[PDB]
Amino acid sequence: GPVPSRARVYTDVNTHRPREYWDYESHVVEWGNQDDYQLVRKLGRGKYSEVFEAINITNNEKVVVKILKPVKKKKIKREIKILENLRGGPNIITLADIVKDPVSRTPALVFEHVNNTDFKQLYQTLTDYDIRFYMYEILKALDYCHSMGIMHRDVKPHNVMIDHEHRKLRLIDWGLAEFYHPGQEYNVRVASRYFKGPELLVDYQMYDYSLDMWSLGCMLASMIFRKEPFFHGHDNYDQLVRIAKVLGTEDLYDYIDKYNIELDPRFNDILGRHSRKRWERFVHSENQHLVSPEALDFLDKLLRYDHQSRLTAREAMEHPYFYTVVKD
Ligand SMILES: [O]C1=C(N([O])=O)[C]=C(/[C]=C2\SC3=C([C]=C(S(=O)(=O)[C]C4=C(Cl)[C]=[C][C]=C4Cl)[C]=[C]3)[N]C2=O)[C]=[C]1
């Protein structure tokens, strides 16, 4: 069977916290007053929630209200407990309240509101400096949640709110986030297609925080190369082929062989044989101002098949790529 794996950092954070910290099933929700919040307009609907702009009438301030759908019930307390655990962390969205929506009869989560620009608009605007600045800000959030024994598992542009005017960033949508327990086997059906790590795509369940670092690397590549998304698979199978067309098939086989994983036989006809490509291949006159030797080295160290070989968040923050970013 598959060889086991453990995170190289924050391995035992949850085992040394009190049980109530991670045992979310036993958590008891304390409700606020639903009449404090008036819905103003629908912002979005996903598989698991509807999100609204609202006004808190106790201060007349804009808030965000996320009305949870009754999908997987366990997700509800999991998300709530994770948000409370992380509240106050750097660039973590602040859960301000929890109310019972009278129409859905489900929890509505009340968040601080962030003024955002659609990433499709904004990423076309970012300078080299802006990219490094915001990547560093995301790393603060990820090192924080990893240090607190939590993996996000849905890092993607849509889950990073940026108020560009005030240079403010928040990591949102913790509905897929999970507590890391060494040796635990997790659902591989997480993350959005273009940001799924190789571990998910080869059905290796004993993954960790390093999943978020693959996802971040996918974001970085799309930004510095101006290619949205970078790995553009038409399904979860073709997603791995697209990655292997860049990182090569020999290192993919080395990866699955290390963990004694067997690829789905489905890949036999479609994977082919691919050399590892040099990152310089994706540089052209329209993105070269976003690329530097430092950017390419940093990206190279995030996008590794072996989840154990990727930079950790903290190591990433030490990288030369960030030397030019003014520290606050
Ligand atoms: O778990 C969450 C979630 N979530 O689940 O989506 C959202 C949030 C907060 C959000 S969502 C949210 C906005 C702002 C906008 S926006 O300013 O309206 C940006 C736009 C607009 Cl005008 C139109 C189309 C797309 C977007 Cl992104 C959209 C969505 N800002 C927020 O602070 C917190 C926690």
Residue numbers in the entry: 3 to 330
Paper text:
To gain an understanding of the mechanisms by which 108600 inhibits CK2 kinases, we expressed, purified, crystallized, and determined the structure of the human CK2α1 catalytic domain in complex with 108600. The structure was solved by molecular replacement and refined to 1.80 Å resolution. 108600 binds in the cleft between the two domains, where ATP would normally be accommodated and adopts a conformation where the NO2 group and the aromatic ring are coplanar. Our studies show that the O3 and N4 of 108600 take the positions of the O6 and N1 atoms of GMP-PNP, respectively, and maintain the same interactions with the backbone atoms of His115 and Val116. Moreover, the NO2 group of the drug is near the position that is occupied by the Pα group of AMP-PNP or GMP-PNP and establishes a hydrogen bond with the side chain of Lys68. In addition, the central benzothiazinone and aromatic rings are involved in numerous hydrophobic contacts with residues such as Leu45, Val66, Ile95, Phe113, and Ile174 that line the ATP/GTP binding cavity. Importantly, a water molecule (wat1) in the drug complex forms hydrogen bonds with the OH group of the drug and the side chain of Glu81. Significantly, the drug mimics not only the shape and electrostatics of AMP-PNP/GMP-PNP, but also their hydration patterns in the CK2α1 active site pocket. Intriguingly, in the presence of 108600, the β4–β5 loop adopts the “closed” conformation that is obstructive to holoenzyme formation. 108600 may thus inhibit CK2 as a both a competitive inhibitor of ATP/GTP and as an allosteric inhibitor that weakens the interaction between C2Kα and C2Kβ in vivo.
CK2, while ubiquitously expressed, appears to be especially critical for growth and survival of cancer cells, with its activation being associated with aggressive tumor behavior and higher levels correlating with poorer prognoses across multiple tumor types. The structure of CK2α1 has the familiar bilobal architecture of a protein kinase, composed of N-terminal lobe followed by a larger C-terminal lobe. Previous work has shown that CK2 is able to use both ATP and GTP as phosphoryl donors with similar efficiencies. The CK2 holoenzyme is an established microtubule associated protein (MAP) that aids in tubulin polymerization and regulates microtubule cytoskeletal reorganization.
